Amino acid sequence: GLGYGSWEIDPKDLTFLKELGTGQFGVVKYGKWRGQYDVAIKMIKEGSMSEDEFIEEAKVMMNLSHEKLVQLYGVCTKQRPIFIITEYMANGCLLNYLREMRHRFQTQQLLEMCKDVCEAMEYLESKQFLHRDLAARNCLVNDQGVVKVSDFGLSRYVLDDEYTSSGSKFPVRWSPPEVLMYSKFSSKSDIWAFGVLMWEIYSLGKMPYERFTNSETAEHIAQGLRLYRPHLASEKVYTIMYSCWHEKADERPTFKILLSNILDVMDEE
Ligand SMILES: CCOc1nc(-c2n[nH]c(=O)[nH]2)cc2ccccc12
């Protein structure tokens, strides 16, 4: 309506129903839009985000639509704090889901989770859109057990310097050598991170390099050493995740190639 662009949601259309948790930018809630449609509502803490830049980018993110990407519905802009409105994912973050041992996952389920993420990432790659912080903590799970990739590109708008530089909150354990050494981000740094995410999935949510500090991790990978095979990963699955960790970025696969490799293993195993 009148005072709203296509990227803007009227906060008066929201019904708040349950507090879901707290994240980077503060509280997240479950609610309904216009009485009917399930949404997640992120309340963005004052001073946490480069808001004008985020809002311009939200225009681009709205047009990223793939069934394995958590959809951005819009932003509530006229106000303090602003809200980000997204697709509700009832089973929450992938990391916590993996860590719940009651699920008793079969390896075919774990490979399906990898395939879900890979499809999302192949779509982002086709749009020349980098995630920049791919990890299990940034994937969500819906009520049907489908994994989707969330918060794609959002790290570009975080004002907390501890998060933004290789900083005490930087994702060292998901980063390739060229990122840690010289801040060279590319499609191939997303590929690296995807390999670590596969490792997280097959490790049922263990922390990568769990016995090392971030400084030790950086030293280990710069010296050419790697994560090794999770017990639940077959030789073929391990080969796929390991392929993401070539020292030379141009020898790493694309997401299209990874997807093909994952589908081959699904057929074989
Ligand atoms: C602090 C974030 O926590 C959570 N976020 C979402 C969520 N859905 N969509 C989205 O963008 N976030 C869904 C959840 C479901 C159960 C428990 C926690 C959840």
From Swiss-Prot:
Changing residue 224 to D: In XLA; mild; interferes with substrate binding and/or domain interactions. Belongs to the protein kinase superfamily. Tyr protein kinase family. TEC subfamily. Changing residue 93 to S: Found in patients with chronic lymphocytic leukemia; uncertain significance; results in resistance to ibrutinib therapy; results in a protein that is reversibly inhibited by ibrutinib; disrupts the covalent binding between the enzyme and ibrutinib and. ATP binds at residues 20-28, 42. This is Tyrosine-protein kinase BTK. It comes from Homo sapiens (Human). Part of a complex composed of EEIG1, TNFRSF11A/RANK, PLCG2, GAB2, TEC and BTK; complex formation increases in the presence of TNFSF11/RANKL. Binds GTF2I through the PH domain. Interacts with SH3BP5 via the SH3 domain. Interacts with IBTK via its PH domain. Interacts with ARID3A, CAV1, FASLG, PIN1, TLR8 and TLR9. Interacts with MPL/TPOR. It comes from the Eukaryota. The chain holds residues 389 to 658 of 659 of the full protein. It is linked to X-linked agammaglobulinemia: Humoral immunodeficiency disease which results in developmental defects in the maturation pathway of B-cells. Affected boys have normal levels of pre-B-cells in their bone marrow but virtually no circulating mature B-lymphocytes. This results in a lack of immunoglobulins of all classes and leads to recurrent bacterial infections like otitis, conjunctivitis, dermatitis, sinusitis in the first few years of life, or even some patients present overwhelming sepsis or meningitis, resulting in death in a few hours. Non-receptor tyrosine kinase indispensable for B lymphocyte development, differentiation and signaling. Binding of antigen to the B-cell antigen receptor (BCR) triggers signaling that ultimately leads to B-cell activation. After BCR engagement and activation at the plasma membrane, phosphorylates PLCG2 at several sites, igniting the downstream signaling pathway through calcium mobilization, followed by activation of the protein kinase C (PKC) family members. PLCG2 phosphorylation is performed in close cooperation with the adapter protein B-cell linker protein BLNK. It is found in: Cytoplasm; Cell membrane; Nucleus; Membrane raft. Changing residue 20 to P: In XLA; moderate. Residues 14-266 form the Protein kinase domain. Predominantly expressed in B-lymphocytes. Coiled coil: none annotated. The modification Phosphotyrosine is found at residues 163, 228. The PH domain mediates the binding to inositol polyphosphate and phosphoinositides, leading to its targeting to the plasma membrane. It is extended in the BTK kinase family by a region designated the TH (Tec homology) domain, which consists of about 80 residues preceding the SH3 domain. Following B-cell receptor (BCR) engagement, translocates to the plasma membrane where it gets phosphorylated at Tyr-163 by LYN and SYK. A motif (CAV1-binding) lies at residues 192-199. Dasatinib binds at residues 86-89. Changing residue 178 to K: In XLA; severe. The active site is at 133 (proton acceptor). Changing residue 200 to G: In XLA; moderate; interferes with substrate binding. The modification Phosphoserine is found at residues 215, 234. Clofedanol binds at residues 86-89, 154.
